[PDB]
UniProtKB/Swiss-Prot annotation, chain A:
This is Nitrogen regulatory protein P-II homolog. Keywords: ATP-binding, Chloroplast, Magnesium, Metal-binding, Nucleotide-binding, Plastid, Transcription, Transcription regulation, Transit peptide. The keyword Acyltransferase does not apply. Disruption phenotype: No visible phenotype under normal growth condition, but increased sensitivity to elevated levels of nitrite. Belongs to the P(II) protein family. GO terms for biological process: anthocyanin-containing compound biosynthetic process; regulation of arginine biosynthetic process via ornithine; regulation of fatty acid biosynthetic process; regulation of nitrogen utilization; response to light stimulus; response to sucrose. The chain holds residues 68 to 192 of 196 of the full protein. Induction: By light and sucrose. Down-regulated by treatment with amino acids. Coiled coil: none annotated. Homodimer. Interacts with NAGK. Interaction with NAGK is dependent of MgATP and inhibited by 2-oxoglutarate, arginine, glutamate, citrate, and oxaloacetate. The keyword Transit peptide applies. One of its GO terms (molecular function) is ATP binding.
């Protein structure tokens, strides 16, 4: 990927009713945590949700594929996935940084 | 300089602007042929100022027209008009088809 | 290292933290002269059960990043599981809407 980076944010803008399917699919590949927020596409709007996950470079393709598995319906309006370089990941609780900081360690 | 660092094929143009200027920005962007803007409610400084984040991912060569157009739609002249951020995007994937890169952009 | 990869003039510091720590993080940043933090509500899905968090975003110069990280931790840390994470992403440029000022003038 260009830019090259140790970590990447995978940002998926998908249908709100596909949250659980994407989340469950990610869990199967060891991605235990996703961050979700409400967004609107074009007072007429289309409701979407942004799903954000930060992973190591070697996990990006698996994450993309897994999100598609959960989010795809075959109908126009399935959304888009963006990949952005992440220079650093820090765990607030411990100050751990990098690989020691990327995994989600919240309660299930 | 248009040669943004880091170099990337795509960039996210992220604008934090006044909530009431969103239709104006969207319309202005439509006038230059750009669609697919995503909008979300954010807040700046339990007292807050309501703002809207508008996000559009485009090719490197579209960035300057997008910046100019957002300003055109969002500027009022008063303090609090907001800011625009440009961030490198390594790839774009259309969920429906699996198309990647330029095919997936619009 | 402070020499972040990718190398960039600016970086977005993105903190996903406990909602009740907003005021402490904002105050702490103010104490080091940092203003212009933007916040939004997010849901940690990782019945439709979730954890409420707030995403705090600030775009700063490369040389402000370490102070910003440390200050956010100071404001947001409780020591208990669930304090959240900070992400750092390169930002190629900042533009002020009112003036059209770019680069450091805008940031």
């Amino acid at each position: 990927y260009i830019p090259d980076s140790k970590f990447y944010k995978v940002e998926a803008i998908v249908r709100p009713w596909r949250i659980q399917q994407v989340s469950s699919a990610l869990l199967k590949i060891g991605i235990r945590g996703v961050t979700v927020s409400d967004v609107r596409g074009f007072d007429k709007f289309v409701a979407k949700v942004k799903m954000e996950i930060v992973v190591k470079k070697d996990q990006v393709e698996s994450v993309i594929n897994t999100i598609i598995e959960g989010a795809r319906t075959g109908e126009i309006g399935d959304g888009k996935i963006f990949v952005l370089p992440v220079s650093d990941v820090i765990r607030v609780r411990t100050g751990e940084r990098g690989e020691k900081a990327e995994k989600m360690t919240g309660d299930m």
